[model samples]
Target chain A: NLENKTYVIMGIANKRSIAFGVAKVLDQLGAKLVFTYRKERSRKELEKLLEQLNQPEAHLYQIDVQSDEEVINGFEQIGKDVGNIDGVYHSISETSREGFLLAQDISSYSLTIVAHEAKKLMPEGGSIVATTYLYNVMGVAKASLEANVKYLALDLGPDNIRVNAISAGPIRGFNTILKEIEERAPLKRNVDQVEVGKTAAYLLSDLSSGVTGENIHVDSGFHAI
Target chain B: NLENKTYVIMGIANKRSIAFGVAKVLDQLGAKLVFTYRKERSRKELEKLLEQLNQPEAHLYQIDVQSDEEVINGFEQIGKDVGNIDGVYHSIAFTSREGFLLAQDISSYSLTIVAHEAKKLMPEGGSIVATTNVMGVAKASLEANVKYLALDLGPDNIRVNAISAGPIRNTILKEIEERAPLKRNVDQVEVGKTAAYLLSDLSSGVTGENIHVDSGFHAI
Candidate 1:
């Protein structure tokens, strides 16, 4: 069990979001939860999601990853309120929004922005996990995020901090796209959010203590076809 | 760039062996190499293969993974001879030839055996690259060995990784090439280049990772 450890789960939009899945698993493993919401509607949904947890004493904050100041100030506030932190699950990602800078900011650049500040709170060393789906234009952002994980791991290794990513395969939420991937995938199926949650737990737990700068695929061998 | 670094290469049976491919690339990258040969016949083939390398001043040792004494004594001797090593390329693998116990020994336990002694020579941090092919009874065992060994040795700052190379030049290679997204078979040279990366500081942050260099064949 991950008792006495605290984790931050950002970008939970709905029940289907990967961040919510990670929260559910981390909660089950006896870890305290802290969530960050971007939009007004998302905050409402997160309230209902928190009610479902057995112990719903979770910290909630509003911060937009698109803004560098918001991300930096948000973690600084969490540090004052929660004190020392153990790990962070950066499950926030956005698709291309018809603008190049905005898309890259939300999807890719936010990772480093979050880590840059999050490291200040993890003085004793910790883990950072990012969710990256590789396909279409999103692949560009995910690829960049993955490379950042590598560089971050190297930069933070001497400090005992680890950075890793989960490359999830197509899930049911993708609808028709999921069908296409499932048909062509080696497993002939789509992965569920909980499958990704388990892998995320592994990265955040002591089981993967020695792992860093690695992108683990929880996609039913879909990446390996 | 690898001039100041020295690497140990294991399991070179012939020119066709992937170990030789890695040796070829590492030698070209300017890293000093020390090779291990199991038998006199293999040693002869290794000598012939070395002739093809542009720089051929590689040290050669004899150590069979099947024996605990040889595996331990081999590296102890290597430390005395080579002083300090920066990395090791474990391209050695064996199939089920005679008995079930022997199969486990060659395919799986050999990795732990080699790593146990190899770490002794690596007082400072280093990299360990294991070559794993996805075929035969050894596949599952070798894959598991790589994962656990990566974690077990990571505390020592020794990065461990595996390359699950697809079948090459076999009947299935054509079928795989047709199915692969890249529409090609995995190249030997490409595998060699990847091995070089894992052996170098370029992949310092990469440990407990299994990289598939099979021309997008793994991506269906």
Candidate 2:
């Protein structure tokens, strides 16, 4: 049971965010959650969604991954206010087909900088996981992210911290290329956000103590090709 | 002689700059040179160096590879003034120790943004060249960029390629000398020569490729 364990979840935009999906699973399993949102509107949306859950002591902090100052100061507050953190769910990126390489400036660097701050907070040991996938400009950015995971894993390994990523397939968050995606996957269907949540929980939990520097695909076996 | 040929060389910081090494070879071979410098200080540095060469018509423009606006508009201006470009030598990168993250922004992103702009300027078909090493994560991102970008620009007949890091040194050089098949470090000009080959018709069939000037250091 994750009752006393605390975790931070960043990038929860709405009920549909992959981050919120993971948050729900962790919440149901009885983990304390702290959230970081860039927009106040997203925090309100997050607060409304939190009303449906059992996390009465949940903390919400405004941390813009774009600024090192916000990341540093906000997490400092999380330390003062919440005490200890067991894991972090970082789901941040801006993906597309045009000028995609530029996406890495924020998509990958956010983790690099955040990981630097996070390394300071996790004195004992912790797991940090990211969300990623494949496709053109988005695909290229994913390529960069996957590399970042490997290197960050190495950088944090000394602190007993683990770094990994979840590659979730197209979801309600994506589209009804549903029939199209179904035909391509060996499992014959797209995976849902909750399915992604389960895999994320596995990566974040003590049950995954032996796992680090890995990427587990919850995409209904679509990437096998 | 590159009498009828013109090329754009980006990122010449000083005489010891890798891009300047290639610029000197291309300049001596009779190719007309147009340069892109981000800062006015770098422009004067480039200007002073050009004065020592025979490139009387060498042109310079300020283009920050970080911005899509600067990359797009700078090339438009280059096309209007210099007319046509045969190839582009892109040597933009930052090897700063504290600036590990900045490397991807200036080093890798610069090429992709510049490639799109360079593609518009090279209508008949052209070549683009770059270089970076395996010392860190930034280079890995840079190498991946070369592959994905290669696929995107192929239909336009624009060839893109790179060389593994060379002439940038330390224990890295000692390791290179000890482990490499060549049994010695590579010189700046040799790296320049590989870049020149990539930028020339001599490597006509090579695209989406990164050739190591490390003398089979990668092979081992």
Candidate 3:
């Protein structure tokens, strides 16, 4: 269905990146890719991984979330080289390094910046989905991000664009430890990568036509309390 | 506890009132009561009901949630009669005679009035526990009341509480019968007894708490 549609995948730092799972699923579903990565040293590795895509047309770009100018410039470049986009996967989050406390003040600033930058690229009929924790140590930041979604959803609905957050259950990949969280979580088990990827694809696709300005949890029944 | 504290239990229409449940439990644990009823018929019913309580000094007042003056005057009377108050149980909600609705606008306006009236009384540290439903046709209004309670109760150390009960299967109860996940729903007495637990200093650390006495219904 994504024959000529260009989809931008953000947050891929490595094969272990949660965005990588989303990218793989989107590619498999026949969407053309414009991948964004932050680090220079990781460029060749990402290039090597993209080569296995079987499709020779997919491309990559460097855009750091640390700057809105870079994101705008990068996307402007993509629209020039790759043409117009149908959607974007915002698989990024700012969290404490395992067990570290992300004090509320810092995280809120970072998340608001990210939300503002994400809102910059939309034209029409597009979907933007972010990955978030239910009540992260960075909860204050996530709360602001959630507020951004609601406000943006209202602003963008006339343009037929949707903004939503996926509150996945605690999953351990490249992020952090899971043992303590799994023990305390009401669900008593952890969600995995493939399930998270499938949910991303669903939200990024037209199948979620009726949903927007909402955070859907793919977290194996956690947060029910 | 009775030596010093006073709490007003509002929305008691009769002996089967949920407010009485909180009143009974708090009384057993030694809390003096100030009961509010909506109608004279209810006040007469309550007059007879108070005979069941060995404590003859238990006080009752007439306050209609639908009228702001009644709410203001009722609490004023309580302040004049009982002096300092310790807590208030807002065991109140309203629905059309047809019951909870998925899309009715009435539920929203009704909750707005009820919640604003309740918040008008509290000025400082204490508790304000209200009952709420888990899932019903009026689910949206249920959340609205909860949000209002939380927002109002947060500033003062006054804990605004709700018991998000699972479906209980009493035909007399307004919470729906069809969607009760427990198959049998919660018993009225269990709900009554739990309200007691929440109202007392036993729940001192608990404020803005929404304890689901509906067993594991909301836990999914």
Best by DockQ: 1
Question: What are the per-residue Cα lDDT tens digits for candidate 1 across B1-220?
Answer: 5887899999888777888878887888888888999996787777777788855475778999899999888898889887989999887665344566667678778888888888988877788888873245666777777767776766576767787776666567768756554345655566677787778764544456687665434433
Worst 10 residues of 2 chain B by lDDT: B211-220
Ranking of candidates on DockQ, top first? 1, 3, 2
Tens digit per residue, CA lDDT, model 3, A167-190: 665555434447644454333456
Per-residue lDDT value at B194 in model 1: 71
Isolated chain A: TM-score per model? 0.91, 0.92, 0.80
Which interface RMSD does candidate 3 score? 16.7
Give residue A156's error in model 3 in angstroms. 1.0
| Tens digits of lDDT, candidate 2, A68-146 | 8999998889989987689899997545544664577567878888788877778987989998643356666787887
Q: Put down candidate 2 lDDT per residue, B16-133, tens digits, no spaces.
A: 8878877887877778899989887788888899997899776899998878898898999999998979888888665566576567777787888888888888888788887765
Write down the lDDT that model 3 would get. Answer: 0.60
Pairs that collide, model 3? A169-A219, B101-B137
Candidate that scores best on TM-score: 1
Q: Is candidate 1 or candidate 3 better by TM-score?
A: 1
Backbone collisions counted per model: 1, 1, 2
Which stretches in model 3 have alpha-carbon errors above 4 Å? Answer: A93-122, A133-137, A173-188, B1-220
How good is the docking of model 2, as DockQ?
Answer: 0.01
